[PDB]
Amino acid sequence: GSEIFLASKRAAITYDTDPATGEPRAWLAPGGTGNVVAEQAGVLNISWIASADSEDDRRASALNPDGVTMELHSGREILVRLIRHDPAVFRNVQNFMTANLMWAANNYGWDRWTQPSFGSDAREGWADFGRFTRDFADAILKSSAQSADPVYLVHDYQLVGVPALLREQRPDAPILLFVAIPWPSADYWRILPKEIRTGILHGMLPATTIGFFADRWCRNFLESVADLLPDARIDREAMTVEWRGHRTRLRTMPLGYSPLTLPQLPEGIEEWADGHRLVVHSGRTDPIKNAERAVRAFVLAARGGGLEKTRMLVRMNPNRLYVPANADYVHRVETAVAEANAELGSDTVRIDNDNDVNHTIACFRRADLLIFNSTVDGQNLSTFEAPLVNERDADVILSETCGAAEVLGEYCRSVNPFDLVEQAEAISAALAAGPRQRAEAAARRRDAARPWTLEAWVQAQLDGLAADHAARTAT
Amino acid sequence: GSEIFLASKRAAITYDTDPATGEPRAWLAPGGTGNVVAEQAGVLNISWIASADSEDDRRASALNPDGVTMELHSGREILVRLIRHDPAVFRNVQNFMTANLMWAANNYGWDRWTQPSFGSDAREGWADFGRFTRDFADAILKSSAQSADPVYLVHDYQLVGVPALLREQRPDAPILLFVAIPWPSADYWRILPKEIRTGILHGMLPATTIGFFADRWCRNFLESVADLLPDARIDREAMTVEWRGHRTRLRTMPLGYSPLTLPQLPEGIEEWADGHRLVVHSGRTDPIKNAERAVRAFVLAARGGGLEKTRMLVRMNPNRLYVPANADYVHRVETAVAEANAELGSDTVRIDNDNDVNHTIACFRRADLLIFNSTVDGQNLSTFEAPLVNERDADVILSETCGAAEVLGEYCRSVNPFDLVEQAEAISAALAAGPRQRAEAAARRRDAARPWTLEAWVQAQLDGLAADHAARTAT
Ligand SMILES: Nc1nc2c(ncn2[C@@H]2O[C@H](COP(=O)(O)OP(=O)(O)O)[C@@H](O)[C@H]2O)c(=O)[nH]1
Numbered sequence: 015g016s017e018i019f020l021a022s023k024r025a026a027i028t029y030d031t032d033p034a035t036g037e038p039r040a041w042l043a044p045g046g047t048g049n050v051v052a053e054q055a056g057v058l059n060i061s062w063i064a065s066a067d068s069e070d071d072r073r074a075s076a077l078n079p080d081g082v083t084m085e086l087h088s089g090r091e092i093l094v095r096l097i098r099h100d101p102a103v104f105r106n107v108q109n110f111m112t113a114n115l116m117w118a119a120n121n122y123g124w125d126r127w128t129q130p131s132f133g134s135d136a137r138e139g140w141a142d143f144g145r146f147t148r149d150f151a152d153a154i155l156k157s158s159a160q161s162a163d164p165v166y167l168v169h170d171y172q173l174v175g176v177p178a179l180l181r182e183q184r185p186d187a188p189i190l191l192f193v194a195i196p197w198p199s200a201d202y203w204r205i206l207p208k209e210i211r212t213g214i215l216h217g218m219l220p221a222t223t224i225g226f227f228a229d230r231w232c233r234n235f236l237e238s239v240a241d242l243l244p245d246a247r248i249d250r251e252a253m254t255v256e257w258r259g260h261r262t263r264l265r266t267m268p269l270g271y272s273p274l275t276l277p278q279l280p281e282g283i284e285e286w287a288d289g290h291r292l293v294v295h296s297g298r299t300d301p302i303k304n305a306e307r308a309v310r311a312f313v314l315a316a317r318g319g320g321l322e323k324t325r326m327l328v329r330m331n332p333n334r335l336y337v338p339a340n341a342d343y344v345h346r347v348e349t350a351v352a353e354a355n356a357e358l359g360s361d362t363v364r365i366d367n368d369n370d371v372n373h374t375i376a377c378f379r380r381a382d383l384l385i386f387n388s389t390v391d392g393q394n395l396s397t398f399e400a401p402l403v404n405e406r407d408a409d410v411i412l413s414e415t416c417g418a419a420e421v422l423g424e425y426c427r428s429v430n431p432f433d434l435v436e437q438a439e440a441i442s443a444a445l446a447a448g449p450r451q452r453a454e455a456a457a458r459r460r461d462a463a464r465p466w467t468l469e470a471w472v473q474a475q476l477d478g479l480a481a482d483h484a485a486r487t488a489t
Numbered sequence: 490g491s492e493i494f495l496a497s498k499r500a501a502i503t504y505d506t507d508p509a510t511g512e513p514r515a516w517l518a519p520g521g522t523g524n525v526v527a528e529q530a531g532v533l534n535i536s537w538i539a540s541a542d543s544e545d546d547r548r549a550s551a552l553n554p555d556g557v558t559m560e561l562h563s564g565r566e567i568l569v570r571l572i573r574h575d576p577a578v579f580r581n582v583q584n585f586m587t588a589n590l591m592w593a594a595n596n597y598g599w600d601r602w603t604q605p606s607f608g609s610d611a612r613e614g615w616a617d618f619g620r621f622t623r624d625f626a627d628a629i630l631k632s633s634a635q636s637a638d639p640v641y642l643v644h645d646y647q648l649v650g651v652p653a654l655l656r657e658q659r660p661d662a663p664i665l666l667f668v669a670i671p672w673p674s675a676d677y678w679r680i681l682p683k684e685i686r687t688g689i690l691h692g693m694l695p696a697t698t699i700g701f702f703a704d705r706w707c708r709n710f711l712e713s714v715a716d717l718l719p720d721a722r723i724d725r726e727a728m729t730v731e732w733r734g735h736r737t738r739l740r741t742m743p744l745g746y747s748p749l750t751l752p753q754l755p756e757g758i759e760e761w762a763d764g765h766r767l768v769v770h771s772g773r774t775d776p777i778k779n780a781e782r783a784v785r786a787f788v789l790a791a792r793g794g795g796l797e798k799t800r801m802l803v804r805m806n807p808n809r810l811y812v813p814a815n816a817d818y819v820h821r822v823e824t825a826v827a828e829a830n831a832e833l834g835s836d837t838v839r840i841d842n843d844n845d846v847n848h849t850i851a852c853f854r855r856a857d858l859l860i861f862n863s864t865v866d867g868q869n870l871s872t873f874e875a876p877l878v879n880e881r882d883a884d885v886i887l888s889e890t891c892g893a894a895e896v897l898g899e900y901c902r903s904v905n906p907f908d909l910v911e912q913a914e915a916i917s918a919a920l921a922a923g924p925r926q927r928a929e930a931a932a933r934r935r936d937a938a939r940p941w942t943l944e945a946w947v948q949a950q951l952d953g954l955a956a957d958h959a960a961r962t963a964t
């Protein structure tokens with residue numbers, strides 16, 4: 015049985031008080047990555063190291079600096095250890111990670127002609143990132159200090175610098191890093207200042223395994239390594255890097271949905287949609303989700319005719335609205351919806367901007383057409399969840415630039431997310447399709463989506479790491 | 490000797506009247522590509538097919554539809570054939586090629602989050618591009634109808650669709666296409682609508698040889714082909730594409746300068762720069778030339794101390810100001826210059842915006858520091874010309890994304906064009922270096938730049954085409 019040490023930016027703990035006794039309670043949320051790892055075969059025990067990012071987390075960390083054992087179903091347990099970072103460092107690294115810098119870097123947000131223009135802010139951001147990375151590595155190693163053969167799983171882009179620091183003190187350990195966002199083309203990656211574009215690669219390559227959601231991101235990562243590290247040797251076929259002794263395997267490990275996580279509609283929506291076919295676009299208040307272009311394409315489709323009793327819901331989950339790109343995105347979507355309604359008629363298009371998974375799942379079930387047209391997406395789990403819960407045989411329009419398109423693209427209407435005409439034509443054809451044609455397409459779609467579960471993805475990581483560890487050990 | 494048929498967007502002709510008789514005169518501008526091709530050893534005759542783009546051109550075409558024999562020095566001649574395109578098609582294709590579309594496609598101008606959004610105008614532009622391409626192909630083929638083994642050289646991005654149409658009529662001919670601008674990463678190239686991103690590749694690949702200025706553009710082109718054409722097989726080491734029976738060789742053929750194009754400064758500039766060191770940035774009114782970031786970087790350097798008797802000239806060559814990206818570039822430069830002067834003192838930074846190549850060479854000669862920091866550049870010939878004429882041992886700051894950096898980057902201060910701190914440090918370092926260090930660096934820089942002449946570049950195309958044609962025929 016393995017001794018697992020999982021590191022991620024957050025370990026979702028629910029903090030409340032008992033309804034009977036009033037005593038404070040802290041319990042791990044179902045479906046955490048730690049919860050799923052804890053259930054696998056060759057796992058003896060598991061520790062989870064994450065950042066404290068609330069007063070509740072901070073009190074929890076201060077009470078048990080070495081971590082608390084928290085219970086799971088089937089009498090299983092997991093040692094959860096929360097790191098209290100320097101608040102100034104932590105806040106800056108959080109700003110470093112948003113579209114103010116690193117989110118634009120990995121998610122294709124810069125035009126190059128006018129943005130970005132790196133100043134001293136980027137240099138201080140990168141220094142704070144180094145301090146933050148050292149926080150995690152020290153706490154991870156301290157938590158694993160007594161384990162003979164610890165297995166390290168590192169998750170979330172915030173932790174890409176961690177594998178190098180673990181490797182420095184644990185030369186022989188299995189280390190998996192999983193990157194859940196895209197990796198950009200080499201030319202775009204090197205937009206970043208020299209110390210960042212190389213320093214991030216120096217931090218990741220000491221992992222035994224680097225996983226992405228999609229082949230394209232593995233390829234882009236390899237091309238970035240070849241472009242920027244003259245000392246590295248990549249093998250595009252074998253998906254390997256050899257660099258300064260480090261032998262690294264890149265793997266594609268798709269994730270679709272969690273069965274557990276995946277009710278009522280939001281207030282006003284059921285009656286607003288009644289008697290209408292309902293186009294649903296859903297995603298975070300993030301520029302990549304592309305709802306502005308979806309609304310413009312819908313308007314272009316409505317001009318073609320055949321959409322007289324069709325409405326469109328833009329369902330948004332508010333997130334990092336303090337970032338100017340996220341707020342600008344919302345403003346741009348609002349402007350397009352306003353122009354859509356002025357041209358096609360009042361209440362043709364509605365934005366529903368609120369945080370509630372249940373409401374969104376209900377929007378998935380109700381949808382007569384689902385639009386997941388991201389400009390880019392590491393994977394996009396909604397495009398798996400939505401067909402699985404939809405019972406209206408809704409077609410799915412899926413951007414070719416989502417990682418999910420590598421798994422689902424043949425079973426959806428695949429589109430260039432920048433081409434309004436193509437997207438308008440896909441909306442029209444999707445809504446003109448007949449009942450039995452959509453039934454059969456949706457049947458094959460759900461069959462293509464169903465196998466890609468959270469537990470399969472965890473199993474893929476462990477199996478892939480064990481094989482890569484064996485390879486690294488013999489070589 | 491080969492029978493050459495050169496196709497390009499323009500055959501530069503001077504229309505005037507003889508100063509003694511007053512008779513009308515038309516004569517080829519020296520240094521044109523045709524002029525150079527016509528002097529090579531193995532060239533029996535050359536015809537130059539290009540577009541009519543002025544009323545003088547149009548009358549010239551209507552009076553000699555099958556071309557004018559135009560005399561060169563040493564009693565050589567070139568048959569110049571000008572195409573009268575439909576005025577509407579031509580004007581739209583001219584616009585198709587500006588930053589309104591294809592210039593941003595190949596020169597990295599889109600942020601993806603907010604631009605581009607292709608509408609019907611893109612579809613109409615692509616149709617008009619097809620009409621224009623057919624115009625050229627018919628004129629080229631009609632001009633070579635009596636040729637038993639015509640050799641086709643196709644230049645300028647406007648003509649990228651011409652190779653397929655020549656190959657359709659002339660299956661065994663040597664065809665070279667030379668692309669003088671960057672080729673973008675696969676992910677970026679596929680921003681374009683499906684019919685454009687594949688159709689341009691379909692039109693290019695039947696060439697015997699495709700030349701770019703830099704290895705990076707060849708690599709990106711290959712990755713684009715592999716991404717979009719499933720029946721294509723690329724070879725990154727051999728620089729080849731095999732597709733539908735076509736074997737295409739990709740070559741890097743750098744160009745540096747014409748020795749012929751190597752006076753007084755613009756009015757007021759000599760006095761204004763007297764008693765100061767002079768930083769010079771020079772380039773077209775095109776966003777890729779990056780003069781805004783150069784000015785901001787100069788201000789950062791100035792804040793670091795040491796630039797008290799240093800001034801900055803932003804020399805601009807007005808071009809395509811009717812395109813909103815070019816006008817906005819000028820607006821942003823002007824804004825940066827105004828803010829630089831407001832902070833550092835009146836008349837520290839000046840823009841001189843006019844069309845006068847001799848004034849620009851004069852600025853190159855006066856410069857104490859040269860900045861060619863493009864966001865991207867197919868090559869950039871200014872960065873060869875300027876050190877070759879500069880006699881002040883000026884350092885050169887060269888963006889790592891200019892194709893020229895593959896030849897000269899080791900001999901310049903190579904910088905990330907998006908990093909103001911790095912560029913300001915390079916400005917500071919360049920202006921602090923002593924005269925002996927700068928003098929030896931300039932001599933090595935001149936030596937590296939000197940071999941890359943226009944004539945060497947034409948010879949490289951002829952030599953490369955011949956080798957690739959012999960290889961394609963034997964196979
Ligand atoms: N917290 C929250 N989650 C939501 C909401 N609506 C949908 N979701 C879920 O958020 C996840 C979105 O994942 P994905 O599509 O990969 O987009 P990401 O936000 O870029 O990671 C899916 O699991 C959705 O079911 C909401 O209103 N609030």
Ligand SMILES: Nc1nc2c(ncn2[C@@H]2O[C@H](COP(=O)(O)OP(=O)(O)O)[C@@H](O)[C@H]2O)c(=O)[nH]1
Pocket residue numbers: 750773805806843844845846849850868869870871872874
């Ligand atoms: N017509 C004209 N040419 C100029 C002027 N200033 C510089 N040039 C020349 O224009 C060319 C610029 O080419 P390059 O640096 O490769 O950039 P490009 O403009 O993007 O092709 C060089 O040969 C310059 O010497 C000017 O004021 N007018």
